[PDB]
C-alpha cells in the first residue's frame, strides 16, 4: 500500500447564515477554493485524476455538485467526479476515502474536500407531485430535515447534545466556558493574521469576502449565561454554546507520496491513518471517540503522540465529552477557535477544520495532528497526519 | 491487493412512476432488498463492516439514507454508512468502490447497491427561506432539476440523447427497433420466470409487489412509430424509446474472496475490474465507451472475452451508439430486456442491472460478464465480473 | 319604492369535488349560466345595467370575477360589475341587494347570482413574500381557511353543526333521517326530469355536463349509520349527513316590475321581502331563523303563508333545528332534495336553491316561496317570492 | 328617498410595502379605524345596523373580513356584515352602496369603508390540491394576480397607464411633474399637521404608527427623470410616477340625515350623488371620467360647482388624462397630495381619499366635494358630497 500526502489546502472564509454568501452558491464557493488548492499544489487541473467531494444540502443544485465544482475549476471532462454524504463528516471522509483509492493505486492525484451553502438550501413540498387533496400540508425546511435533525428519533441534533450533557454530567457553565474560549481563541487568531494564509478570497461581482464572518468578539460569560435554551425547555444547550449555521467550501489536493516527490511538491502533511465508527444516533456527538481510538490503533499511536487536534465543535456539550474521554490536551485542541465561533457549514466542515489544522501545524512546527468530527445519525470520522 | 467477490444480490421489483411504490419510500425499498441480500449471503447483519449506497433524489428523506437503510436492515449502530451520488452510476459505483476498500484491506464485508423513489421526490421552493418579495417565483420539480436534466447545458437528459442520435446518425426507426426488442425480451423473460429468483417481494400493509410493473407487453413497431418526440420538436427520442421514471432498490453483499472461503459462501461472481470515465456533458450517453475500454484494459481483456453484457438503456439513441462502438454482441446484451421496458430508478439502476446480470450469468453457466451505465454530467461506469 | 321581479334563472349542474368541473373555472361556469339566464329573460346583454355576483374562494382567479363573468357573457364594458362575499349567503344576497338598488331606481335590470369552484381553489403560502427563515412553515388550503372554517373559534363549520346538535338535542339518527330523505328526494326528482328545465349544459371541448353529479342513489340508513364522525371524536356529524364540497354557478335576471311589463316578460316570481340577520358564530347554522322571521315580518306574513321552502342543507344538524324552530312543513322544504344530496358550492348555493325553488313553484302552481341559508361567521339570509 | 349623511371618518396612517404594517393585519387595521369612526359619530357599536366593507387581497384571511372587522370593533353578532370587491373602487363604493340601502329605508346607520394589507397578501399554488405531476409549476403572487394586473389582457395595471399615455399624448415629463407636485403637496400638508385630525394611531404591542410612511420629502425632477420605466421597455411609467403598494384601513359611519338630526350629530357632509361606470379594460385609468359625468348629471351639477376634488392617483398618466378631460381645477385636486406620495392600499383607497376630502373640506370651509377612483377591469366610481 503506498503512502499518501496532502499536497495543498484552501478554504473560503466561513459565512454567517443569511450573510456574506446568502447569494453565492455552494458550487461557486467550491470552485473558488478548488482552483486555489490546485495552484497551491503546483499542478494544473488536467493533472487531477478524479474528484470526491462532500455536500449534504444539495436539493435544487442540479446533478452532482462535485462534477459541477470539478468542471468549474477547469478539470477536464474526462476526469470523474462524485458527491458523498456522511453528513457532518463528509468533507473529511472525502480526504480519507480518496487516500484509500490512491494507496490502492487506482488514482495518483485527487481533488477532495467539501462545499455547503445552508443559506441557499430550499424548502420542500412533499405533497406537490400528487396533491395535498384537502387540508393544510407539510412545507419543510430541507436544512432542518436533511441536515440538522436526527431521522431515527425525530428531533434536532441539539437534543442529541442534551442527551450527552445529561449522561456525561456536563453543566451549562462548562458548556459556556468552552464556547467563551472558542470565541476568544478565534478573535485572537483572526486579529493576529493566523487565518490569512489558509483563506482564499471570494470575489462577488466588486465585493471581496476574506474574513470569517461568524466570530463574535467580546463574547463574555455574562452574555452567554443570559441566553435561553435553544432546543429543550430547561435545557443547557443554547445558540451561544452550539455551532452556527453557515456557508463555505474547503478543498485539498491529495496525491501519492511518490507522485509528490516526482513533481517536487512539498506537502502540507503525510496521511498516517484514519477511522470511521458508529454510536447510537441519540448520542451522535460521541462519535469521535470510537473513530479516534480506531485511527490511533491503526497508527500504533496514543493520544500522547498527537501534537495538535481539531475536533469539530458541533455543540459544546458533545465537545467536552469527547475531549475528556480521549484525554486530549485541553489547550492543544481548536487552538485558533472552533465551530461555535467560526461556524459549521455541514459538508464543508471536515475539510475546513483539516485546512486550519494543517496550516497551524506548519506554523508551530508541530509533527503530528488529528482532525475529527461527530456525525448526525451516530458516527464519527478521524484523520491522523504527520509532517 | 486481494480479490473481492459478490456474495449475493437481491432487488425489489421496479415500480412505475406513481405506481406500486407511490407511497413506499426509497428507504423502505432499500431495507427490504438489504435484509434479503444479507440472508442470501449466509451472514448476519452484524457481520457487515460498513455500507456504501447510491441514492440521488434524497431531498426531504432525512439525514443520509444509506445509514437509514443499514440500521433498518439490522446492521449495528457501530458500523458506518454513507450515501454516494454519481447520478445514474451510483448503484454500480457503490459496488466497485466498496471493492477498492476491501482490496486495500480496510473492510472485509460491505453492503452495497442503491435505492431510489422518483415518485416520492419533492418539489422545491428556492425563494422560501428569504422570500419571493414580489411577482411569481420558481417552484421546482427536484426530479427534473437534480436527476433528469444536465446542469451545464440546462436541458433534459433526453436532449443529450438527441445529440448522440444526430452525431452518430441513429435513426428514429433504429431507436424504436431497440425499444421493441427490449420490451419483447422483458415480456418473454418475465413470463418464463427469469426474474423470479432475483426479486424479493415488497409487502405493503396486505399487498405484495413482486412483478416489474413497467414492462409493456404487446408493444409493436406500429405503436412506437406513432409516438410524438418527447424532448425536441421534430426529434427522434420519444417516451417509447426512452427509459422510464421508476422506483426501486437493489442491494448486494461484497466481501474479500478469502472471507467468502472462510465462511463457505459460494459467490455469485468474482470482481475482475472496473472503470469510471468522463465525456462531454452534451454526449453523456457515450460514457460507457471510455469507461468500458478502461475496465477491459485493466482486466487485460477485450470485448470478445465477455459472455454477457448489461448496458443500461437510458435512451435507445445512446444505447445503439454504445453497442456499435464497443462491438458488443447485439443479442448478448440486455438479454432479459433493459430499462426502456423495466425502468430506470436512477440511483438503484446500476445495482439493478448488476443483479439481473449475475442471475442470468449463473443460469446460462456463462463465465464472464460486464455491467455499464451512462451518467448525467458526462460519465460512464463499468464493472467486469467472472464466475 | 317600486316592485322587483325575477325575470329568469339558470344554473349549471352541480359538480362533485374533483369531478366534472375539476378543470372548468368558476368564471367559465358563471358565463355559461349568465348567457342562458339572459336568453331566458328575452333580453340582450346590453340591456343589463350592472352585475352583482357572489363568489367566496376567489384566490388566484384574477381581478373581480363578477366583471369577468359579465364581460364573458357579452355585457358591454360600460356596465359595472362587483363581487360580493357574505360566505354561504352570497348567491342569494346578490339577488336581494340588487332588488334594493332596483327598488330605489338606480338600476332597471341586473345580472345576479353566484359562482364557485371549490376544486380549483388554491393552496396559500403566507410566509412566501418575506420568507420562512428557518423551520417548517404554513401551507394552507384556502378552501378550508376562507370557506369552510370559522375564524373566530378556529374550527371547521362542522363543529358549529355539532354545537347545534348538542344544544338543540338533535340526534345522529335524526340527522341521518334528514340526509336519507334528501338523497331519495333528489334521486326521485332527477329521475322524473324535474331538474331538466333549470339546468343549462356545460360544454367542455366534446363532453356535455348536464346532470347533478353528487347525488348518491340507493343511500340507505344502514350505510349512513356506519359512517364515522367527520369533525369531532364521538360526534354526530358525518360526511353523509353534511353538505358536500362542490362546483357550480347559478345566475338570474332581476328587473323592475314595470320594466318586465314594458318588455312583455313573464317573470318567474315577484320579490316580496328579504332579511339578513346575525347569530353567534358558534351556532351559525341557526342564522336562517332570525333572518326568516325578519323577512316574514317585513312581508306581513307568517310561515303559514308560505307554500314552498328551500332551506340550504349545510349540515343536517342545523337544518333540523331551523325547520323545527320556524315550524316549517317538513315535506314542503327541499322537495327535490337539498345540499346533502346535490352539493354546496359556497358562493353559488344561494342562487342554486333559489333557481330550484322558482322552477318547482311554477310546476306546482304554488303561490308563495321562501329561500334561506345559514352563513359562516354567524348569519342567515332569506328571500320571499310570490307568483 | 331620504337623504344620507357621512357622520364621521377615521383612517390609519398608510404604511409602506414591507413597512410599518408588515405584520399588522388588514382586520387589525380595520378594527382600529372602525372603533374610532364609531366614537367620532357619537354612537355606540350596537347602533350600527350592518357593515359593508371593501377588501380585495383577502386570501388566507379567513371568512369574510368585513364580519371580522365588525365583531372586532364591538358591533353585536346580530348585525350583518359583508365584504365587497370592485377592486380599487371598493372602499368608496361601500359608502355609496350603503347610502342606497339607507335611502331606501332598509338601514338607518352603517359602518362602511375598506381595509387592505398588500404586504401580508400570500403566494398561491394552483397545482397543490391535485398535484403538479412532473416539471416545474406555477407559484403565484396573489397581489399581482388578483390586485395589480388586468385579467382580460394579462398585463400589469401599469400597462393600462402606458396605453393612456400613448393615446392621450401624456409625456414622461408631464407625468413626473404631477408626481413631483403630489410629493411636495403631501410633504407640506404632513408638516403643517393637516393629516393629524383624520388619522387614528395604530398601537403595536409598544410602537405607535401615526404618520403616513410612504411620502418622499425632497423628491425632485432630477431624481424622477433618472428612474427607469417600471412596466414597458422604453415606457413612460416609472415607480416614481406610479402609485405605491401599501397597507391601511379607512372607516366611516353613514346614516340617514333624519337619524343624525335625532341624535344631534353634526355630520362631515351630506351625500349628493354617486356614479359607477365602465370603460374598456385596456384604458381602465379613464374610468373616473364617465363615472363622474354620471354623478354630476344625477346631482344637476357641473364640474364648476365642485370646490374640492380627490381623484386617486393610480398612475400619473391616467390622472393627467382624467383632470384634463373633466376640466378639473389643477390645484383644487389632491390638495394635500395623492397616492403617488401617500400610497394605494387597494381596497382601502376609496375610503382613504374620501376621509382626506372630508377633513380638508371642513378646514377650508368648502361647500362641495368629489371623490373618484379608476378601477382595474375598466371602471370608475364617484361620490359627490356637500356641507
Amino acid at each position: 500500500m503506498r503512502e499518501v500526502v496532502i499536497a495543498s489546502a484552501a478554504r473560503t472564509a466561513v459565512g454567517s447564515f443569511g450573510g456574506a454568501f446568502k447569494s453565492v452558491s455552494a458550487v461557486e464557493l467550491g470552485v473558488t477554493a478548488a482552483k486555489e488548492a490546485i495552484k497551491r499544489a503546483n499542478i494544473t487541473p488536467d493533472m487531477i485524476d478524479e474528484s470526491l467531494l462532500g455536500g449534504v444540502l444539495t436539493a435544487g443544485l442540479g446533478q452532482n455538485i462535485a462534477r459541477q465544482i470539478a468542471l468549474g475549476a477547469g478539470i477536464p471532462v474526462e476526469k470523474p467526479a462524485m458527491t458523498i454524504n456522511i453528513v457532518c463528516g463528509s468533507g473529511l471522509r472525502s480526504v480519507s476515502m480518496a487516500s484509500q483509492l490512491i494507496a490502492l493505486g487506482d488514482a495518483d492525484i485527487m481533488l477532495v474536500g467539501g462545499a455547503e451553502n445552508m443559506s441557499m438550501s430550499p424548502y420542500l413540498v412533499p405533497s406537490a407531485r400528487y396533491g395535498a387533496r384537502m387540508g393544510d400540508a407539510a412545507f419543510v425546511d430541507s436544512m432542518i430535515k436533511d441536515g440538522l435533525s436526527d431521522i431515527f428519533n425525530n428531533y434536532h441534533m441539539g437534543i442529541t447534545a442534551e442527551n450527552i450533557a445529561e449522561q456525561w454530567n456536563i453543566t451549562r457553565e462548562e458548556q459556556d466556558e468552552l464556547a467563551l474560549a472558542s470565541q476568544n481563541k478565534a478573535e485572537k487568531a483572526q486579529a493576529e493574521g493566523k487565518f490569512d494564509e489558509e483563506i482564499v478570497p471570494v470575489v462577488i461581482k466588486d465585493t471581496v469576502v476574506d474574513k470569517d464572518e461568524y466570530i463574535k468578539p467580546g463574547t463574555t460569560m455574562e452574555k452567554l449565561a443570559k441566553l435561553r435554551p435553544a432546543f429543550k425547555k430547561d435545557g443547557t444547550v443554547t445558540a451561544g454554546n452550539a455551532s452556527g449555521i453557515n456557508d463555505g467550501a474547503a478543498m485539498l489536493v491529495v496525491m501519492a507520496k511518490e507522485k509528490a516527490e516526482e513533481l517536487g511538491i512539498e506537502p502540507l502533511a503525510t496521511i498516517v491513518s484514519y477511522g470511521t465508527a458508529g454510536v447510537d444516533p441519540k448520542i451522535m456527538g460521541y462519535g469521535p471517540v470510537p473513530a479516534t481510538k480506531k485511527a490511533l490503533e491503526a497508527a500504533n499511536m496514543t493520544i500522547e503522540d498527537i501534537d495538535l487536534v481539531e475536533a469539530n465543535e458541533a455543540f459544546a456539550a458533545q465537545s467536552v465529552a469527547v475531549i475528556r474521554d480521549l484525554n486530549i490536551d485541553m489547550n492543544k485542541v481548536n487552538v485558533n477557535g472552533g465551530a461555535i465561533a467560526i461556524g459549521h457549514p455541514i459538508g464543508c466542515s471536515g475539510a475546513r477544520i483539516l485546512t486550519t489544522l494543517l496550516y497551524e501545524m506548519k506554523r508551530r512546527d508541530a509533527k503530528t495532528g488529528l482532525a475529527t468530527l461527530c456525525i448526525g445519525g451516530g458516527m464519527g470520522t478521524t484523520l491522523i497526519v504527520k509532517r
Side-chain angles (χ1 to χ4, degrees), chain A residues 1-204 206-225 227 229-232 234-296 298-387:
Chain A
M1 159 175 199
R2 65 196 176 156
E3 287 190 275
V4 184
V5 302
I6 303 165
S8 65
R11 69 173 183 90
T12 69
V14 177
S16 299
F17 191 31
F21 305 139
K22 184 177 189 178
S23 293
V24 181
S25 72
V27 167
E28 291 171 83
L29 295 173
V31 168
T32 299
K35 290 177 166 185
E36 184 63 18
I38 293 168
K39 290 177 194 158
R40 289 176 184 178
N42 195 23
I43 69 171
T44 51
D46 59 283
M47 294 170 66
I48 300 291
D49 295 315
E50 55 176 292
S51 302
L52 189 66
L53 299 174
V56 180
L57 302 174
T58 62
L61 305 186
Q63 284 178 342
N64 185 12
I65 63 157
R67 180 69 163 178
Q68 299 184 51
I69 293 164
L71 296 191
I75 302 171
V77 299
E78 292 81 8
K79 313 302 183 182
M82 180 162 85
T83 311
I84 69 175
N85 179 7
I86 191 173
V87 205
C88 327
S90 304
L92 189 58
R93 203 179 181 200
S94 70
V95 182
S96 60
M97 186 158 284
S99 86
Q100 292 171 292
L101 305 187
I102 296 166
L104 184 64
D106 287 345
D108 296 332
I109 304 178
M110 293 178 59
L111 177 69
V112 297
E116 198 78 62
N117 191 312
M118 300 181 75
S119 300
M120 298 187 82
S121 66
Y123 280 63
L124 310 172
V125 188
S127 67
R129 185 173 311 288
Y130 300 117
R133 320 312 291 189
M134 180 167 67
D136 292 0
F139 193 95
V140 175
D141 182 345
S142 73
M143 180 188 69
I144 299 293
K145 181 65 177 193
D146 299 336
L148 298 177
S149 68
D150 181 69
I151 193 59
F152 306 104
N153 295 278
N154 302 113
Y155 53 49
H156 198 280
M157 295 270 280
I159 298 299
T160 77
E162 294 286 8
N163 295 335
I164 292 180
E166 290 162 23
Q167 290 171 40
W168 274 256
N169 183 30
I170 301 159
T171 66
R172 169 60 176 276
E173 178 177 22
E174 280 158 354
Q175 292 175 50
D176 283 354
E177 286 162 354
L178 188 146
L180 176 62
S182 187
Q183 291 286 7
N184 281 308
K185 286 180 288 184
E187 183 180 358
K188 181 76 171 158
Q190 182 179 63
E192 292 186 291
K194 299 174 97 195
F195 300 128
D196 294 355
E197 292 176 84
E198 69 199 56
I199 285 172
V200 55
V202 169
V203 178
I204 310 172
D206 295 3
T207 295
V208 177
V209 183
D210 63 6
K211 313 298 291 186
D212 295 306
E213 194 175 23
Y214 189 58
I215 297 168
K216 293 177 172 68
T219 293
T220 67
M221 182 60 66
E222 169 171 25
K223 291 168 176 187
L224 289 165
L227 300 181
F231 302 112
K232 180 175 185 148
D234 298 319
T236 64
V237 178
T238 73
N241 67 32
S243 55
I245 296 172
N246 302 90
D247 308 327
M251 297 287 158
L252 307 89
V253 175
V254 289
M255 63 179 63
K257 183 166 273 267
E258 62 178 343
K259 178 63 66 175
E261 181 183 346
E262 173 193 344
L263 297 174
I265 292 169
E266 193 63 31
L268 287 168
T270 299
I271 293 170
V272 174
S273 68
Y274 41 80
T276 303
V279 297
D280 197 282
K282 292 174 171 69
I283 57 157
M284 71 89 200
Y286 200 70
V289 176
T292 298
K293 289 176 177 179
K294 185 175 186 173
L296 286 165
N300 298 312
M301 292 175 93
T302 73
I303 198 69
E304 299 312 323
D305 300 319
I306 303 296
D307 298 329
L308 194 56
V309 176
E310 284 282 314
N312 196 47
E313 291 174 357
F315 303 89
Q318 65 69 218
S319 288
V320 170
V322 165
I323 287 161
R324 293 183 51 86
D325 284 7
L326 286 171
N327 300 322
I328 292 165
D329 290 336
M330 272 192 89
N331 305 119
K332 307 185 70 202
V333 57
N334 298 352
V335 298
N336 297 334
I340 292 162
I342 297 164
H344 183 25
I346 309 178
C348 161
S349 289
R352 202 292 295 168
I353 72 173
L354 179 58
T355 296
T356 298
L357 180 68
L358 291 168
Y359 275 88
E360 183 65 23
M361 284 178 63
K362 189 162 61 63
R363 77 172 62 88
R364 287 189 174 214
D365 195 27
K367 298 323 175 202
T368 58
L370 191 145
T372 189
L373 307 93
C374 64
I375 304 177
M379 289 171 283
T381 199
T382 301
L383 187 68
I384 303 182
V385 297
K386 68 178 178 183
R387 62 176 293 284

